[PDB]
Amino acid sequence: RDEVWVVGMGIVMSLIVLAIVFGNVLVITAIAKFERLQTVTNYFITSLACADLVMGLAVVPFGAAHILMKMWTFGNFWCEFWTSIDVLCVTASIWTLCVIAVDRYFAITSPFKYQSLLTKNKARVIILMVWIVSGLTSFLPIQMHWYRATHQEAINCYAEETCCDFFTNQAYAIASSIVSFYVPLVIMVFVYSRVFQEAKRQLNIFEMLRIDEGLRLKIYKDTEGYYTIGIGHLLTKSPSLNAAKSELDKAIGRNTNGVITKDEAEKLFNQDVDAAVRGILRNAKLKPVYDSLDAVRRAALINMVFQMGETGVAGFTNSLRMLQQKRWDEAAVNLAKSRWYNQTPNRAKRVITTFRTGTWDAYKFCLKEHKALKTLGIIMGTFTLCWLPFFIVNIVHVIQDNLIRKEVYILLNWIGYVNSGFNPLIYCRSPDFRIAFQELLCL
Numbered sequence: 001r002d003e004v005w006v007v008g009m010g011i012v013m014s015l016i017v018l019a020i021v022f023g024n025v026l027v028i029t030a031i032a033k034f035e036r037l038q039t040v041t042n043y044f045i046t047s048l049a050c051a052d053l054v055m056g057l058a059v060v061p062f063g064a065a066h067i068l069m070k071m072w073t074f075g076n077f078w079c080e081f082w083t084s085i086d087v088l089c090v091t092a093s094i095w096t097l098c099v100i101a102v103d104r105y106f107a108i109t110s111p112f113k114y115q116s117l118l119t120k121n122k123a124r125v126i127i128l129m130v131w132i133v134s135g136l137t138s139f140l141p142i143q144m145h146w147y148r149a150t151h152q153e154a155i156n157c158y159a160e161e162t163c164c165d166f167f168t169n170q171a172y173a174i175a176s177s178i179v180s181f182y183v184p185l186v187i188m189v190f191v192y193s194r195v196f197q198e199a200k201r202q203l204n205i206f207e208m209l210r211i212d213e214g215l216r217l218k219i220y221k222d223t224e225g226y227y228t229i230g231i232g233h234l235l236t237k238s239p240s241l242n243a244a245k246s247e248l249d250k251a252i253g254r255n256t257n258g259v260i261t262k263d264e265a266e267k268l269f270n271q272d273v274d275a276a277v278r279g280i281l282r283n284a285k286l287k288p289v290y291d292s293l294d295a296v297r298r299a300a301l302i303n304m305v306f307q308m309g310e311t312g313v314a315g316f317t318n319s320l321r322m323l324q325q326k327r328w329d330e331a332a333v334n335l336a337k338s339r340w341y342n343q344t345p346n347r348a349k350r351v352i353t354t355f356r357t358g359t360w361d362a363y364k365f366c367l368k369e370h371k372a373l374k375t376l377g378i379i380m381g382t383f384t385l386c387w388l389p390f391f392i393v394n395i396v397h398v399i400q401d402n403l404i405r406k407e408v409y410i411l412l413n414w415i416g417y418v419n420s421g422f423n424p425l426i427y428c429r430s431p432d433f434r435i436a437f438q439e440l441l442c443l
């Protein structure tokens, strides 16, 4: 268009190049310097951030210059090289996302649950394989000119040193699209939906209570100002910190000084959960209700006993009677008309919803590891939304042959490009990344 558009378009493309580079240098630097972030998952995020940095340094600037100058001023060699790097970055990105998905599946299905079954050495070998293989499928069909179209509009462009329009033959456009994008995308969407199914399915009382009670390795006052530690382990109703430290030292079996380990908090929690279940089976009012309930609803009843005690929950005569008669909404009404709901409304709401539904939908993405899984699914969904329009319109115009245009192809390709700037923002969801960024940016 006119000067006003070229300047404004020039500024916008400069900001996108700056945002992609700064953002991805930051991500790579944070994982390179902070030991806590040196995980198998973040080695794959490093693979992803490298592809995005290469996209930002070697692809997007030469593409921007091509749009603004309305020509290619870098010659036929950098044209074929540029095209290949661009193809390599998209392929390496999507295949890395597919590896993350498969790795998260094998983790969630193992006794370890949230830990990769890979060693950091094995993860490095896989990243190297993804890049070597995607580099072979990106650079060989282009340097060998297997991609080349045979119509004169394309042929003139290949010969014209100042033309760098990505004309392909239909078999390359289909073949490269499926192996580079559609195959890993379909696998990633199928495997990661199961990851999300598994996290929800494998929710249990330990995770449910870890969510509701939280974790504190140091003494704190609860809702009622009673001294507590770990995962909702009440130490004493006494208003003395010494009394609470004595009870702590007796329970743990050593001089704690009001501080316990993760191993010690987990051990107490197992005792408390086991006492809550035994208390249910011991109590004649709770045992018939517990027997009539399903696995998810039993956990909601364990949660209540863990918080208020066997005697406390046994006071809910109407609610327990209707839970037994499977009258969930009537049970839920009576449970809300209690001191328990007024004292702890967010926790009572989740327990009442679990009784109402019989599902884990209230505890959905509440655990730190499940929020980590949600973050990875956002990375995958954003990539798909940004790249799928380009790849769909690309495959449609191979069948149909017409209405492809140039202004549409470039625009949808730039939707994909702008995705390299998005992942650093999504990593801010992780508190570990948020801390690294504020440190590196000296905030």
Ligand SMILES: CC(C)CCC[C@@H](C)[C@H]1CC[C@H]2[C@@H]3CC=C4C[C@@H](O)CC[C@]4(C)[C@H]3CC[C@]12C
Pocket: 043, 044, 046, 047, 050, 051, 054, 085, 124, 127, 128, 131
């Ligand atoms: C333009 C093309 C030719 C250059 C491609 C850059 C290559 C060399 C980059 C891109 C992604 C990179 C990998 C990103 C992730 C990791 C995990 C990290 O813990 C060690 C290094 C390792 C294994 C990197 C090695 C180098 C790598 C494969």
Ligand SMILES: C=CCc1ccccc1OC[C@@H](O)CNC(C)C
Pocket: 082, 083, 084, 086, 087, 090, 091, 166, 168, 172, 173, 174, 176, 177, 180, 181, 394, 413, 416
């Ligand atoms: C046929 C579509 C090109 C393609 C094939 C395989 C993998 C990725 C692909 O497309 C990425 C685009 O960003 C390339 N951009 C061109 C080279 C300007």
